[PDB]
Structure formats: C-alpha cells, structure tokens
Homo-oligomer: A and B are copies of this chain.
Amino acid sequence: SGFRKMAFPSGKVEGCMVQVTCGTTTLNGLWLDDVVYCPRHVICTSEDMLNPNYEDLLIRKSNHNFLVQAGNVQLRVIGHSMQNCVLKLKVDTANPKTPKYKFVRIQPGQTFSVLACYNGSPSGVYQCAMRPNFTIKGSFLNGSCGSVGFNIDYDCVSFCYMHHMELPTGVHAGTDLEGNFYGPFVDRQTAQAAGTDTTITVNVLAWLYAAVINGDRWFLNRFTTTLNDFNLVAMKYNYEPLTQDHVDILGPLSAQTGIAVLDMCASLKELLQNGMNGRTILGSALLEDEFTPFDVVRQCSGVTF
C-alpha cells in the first residue's frame, strides 16, 4: 500500500555517466559502446554562446581538445561529429557497463526518470513529466548539463532526454539523444520563454484511480458525463483535451475499480468547479498530473527491473 513519486532504479545509467571538458566548460556525457554523447554547446565559450556557428566552432577542434573522464580514468577521443544539437565523441574503448538500450522520443504527458549529475558524478534521481509546453520541472544547478532522462522496460533502458538549458522561469529544456529539441528552443544564450502550460488530464485521472485503489474515495459521486461536456470544462481550466485514446488507456483502471473514465471525469469536473473543500487526495491539496496510467498500474502491481 501507499503511493509515491517513484523513479526507475538508476544503476544501468550510472555506469554510463562521464565528465566531458572542452577548454573551461565541463559537463556530463553519456558513454554507450565506444561513443560519448553530450550537448554540442560544450564547444562554446560565453561569447560563442551569444550567436554560435557550431559546424565552424567544431572544425577548429582536435580530438585532444576533448578530455573525457570515466571515474578517475581518461578515455582517448579518436573522433568527433554532430547530430543536431548533440556532440558524438568516438572513444578507443567500448563502455563495458553498456546496458541494453534504445534512443526514443517521448510525447508531452509521458514521464521519465532523470539522473542529475555534476562532473560526470551522479548525485540524484527524480521522476519528471514532459509538460505540454515541452519543458520539464527539474532541479538542476550549474554543471547539470548532459544529465539524461530514461525509462526501463524489462532490462532495456530507453533514453529519451538530455538536459541542455534552464529557462528564465526556473524550468528546463533539452533534446532527445538524436539532438532534436523538445519544444521551440535553441542552444543559444538568447531570450527564450516557456509557453503557457496546461494540465495533463489523462495523468490526473490516472492519479484519481491511484487514490481510489489506496482507499481515498471521498471525491467519487453518482454522476457520469461525456467527452464533449468534459472537454468544454477541461479547456476552461487549462486542461488538455481528453481523447478516446486516453479513455482506452485508462480502461484497466476503470475495470479494476468499477469507476468508468467518464464517471471519474464527473469527479474531476466537480474538483475543478468546487475545489477540494479542505480535503486532500493521496496527501496532496493540488491535482497531481505527473503519473501516467502505466505508472499507476506499475506501482500498484509491483513490476521490477
């Protein structure tokens, strides 16, 4: 029993974190087989970052301009290239701790675990969701750049995120492991802002199902609604539209608790219009939106890695 914001065990990813230094910039790289992946902005100085030409800045660099440290050993860089916004440094040694892995791109609303590191040294792990505005509500201090986000399914690590930058509102922007930004962001020291965020409706409903499974039932009512009725309410409170795919994904939770998704929507409608009237749900006074349906089912059935 109980319900906690739960990260994947980080051990398979800890074995891949290295320090990458180019001149006076140090940040984190991901070492898989014989390639280290890290943000391309590692080749920039303060001045360069104002308006960088990357293909230009990179052409000037020799392999020995990249110091890669794995724990307290040196890796020899034998090659370098860019893919979008990530620098791929080829090294002479395959990482013997390389796990089974894939690079995947996640959709907004999907969650993942972030291993925060500093100087190639993992310091913490937390669970994040990709916001609808493509930012993450992370916790990063200077030297966190190149920290990665991952999911585990069976023994296979799915890397989905690499940290590139903080936005002026305290939130974080990065790329998939192929160097494609999540959101309308660029790796340049310029004026960029998080767009208006919205609430991930399917995740709130998942968390309401988590609450019911843990015996927190006060918000249930006799009422049901329709998608269209509900979506007009959602739009009004800055909630993402709920689609038929969403209802289908919540299906198992609807069957395990006897509460139909449009039944639970009628509960969420009422929490949106009236508030929580002094009560909490799973010890929270806000509606939690960073648990997916899969996350609720996984934690309430004890799947291991």
- Chain A residues near B (Cβ < 8 Å): 1-12, 14-15, 115-119, 121-126, 128, 137-144, 166, 170-172, 214-215, 280, 283-286, 298-305
- In the complex, the answer to whether B170 meets A1 with C-beta atoms within 8 Å is yes
- In the complex, the answer to whether B4 meets A128 with C-beta atoms within 8 Å is yes
Q: Show 21 residue pairs from A and B whose CB-CB distance is below 8 angstroms, ordered by the A residue.
A: A1-B171, A2-B138, A2-B171, A4-B126, A6-B126, A6-B139, A7-B10, A9-B11, A9-B14, A9-B125, A10-B10, A10-B125, A11-B12, A11-B122, A119-B304, A122-B305, A123-B303, A137-B283, A139-B299, A144-B302, A284-B286
- In the complex, the answer to whether B302 meets A141 with C-beta atoms within 8 Å is yes
- In the complex, the answer to whether A299 meets B11 with C-beta atoms within 8 Å is no
- In the complex, the answer to whether B215 meets A6 with C-beta atoms within 8 Å is no
Nearest residue, chain B, Cβ from A115: B9
Q: How far is the CB of A274 from chain B (nearest CB, A)?
A: 14
Residue numbers in B under 8 Å from A116 (CB-CB): 6, 302
Stoichiometry (number of copies): 2
Q: How far is the CA of A265 from the CA of B273 in the complex (A)?
A: 33
Residue numbers in B under 8 Å from A299 (CB-CB): 123-124, 139
Residue numbers in B under 8 Å from A123 (CB-CB): 6, 9, 298-299, 302-305
Q: How far is the CB of A47 from chain B (nearest CB, A)?
A: 24
- In the complex, the answer to whether B5 meets A126 with C-beta atoms within 8 Å is yes
Residue numbers in B under 8 Å from A11 (CB-CB): 9-12, 14-15, 122
Knowing A7-B124, A10-B11, A137-B283, say if A172 contacts B305 (CB, 8 Å).
no
- In the complex, the answer to whether B304 meets A2 with C-beta atoms within 8 Å is no
Residue numbers in B under 8 Å from A122 (CB-CB): 9, 11, 304-305
- In the complex, the answer to whether A2 meets B137 with C-beta atoms within 8 Å is yes
Q: How far is the CB of A113 from chain B (nearest CB, A)?
A: 8
Q: How far is the CA of A10 from the CA of B117 in the complex (A)?
A: 13
- In the complex, the answer to whether B1 meets A166 with C-beta atoms within 8 Å is yes
Residue numbers in B under 8 Å from A172 (CB-CB): 2
Residue numbers in B under 8 Å from A215 (CB-CB): 170
Residue numbers in B under 8 Å from A304 (CB-CB): 117-119, 121-123
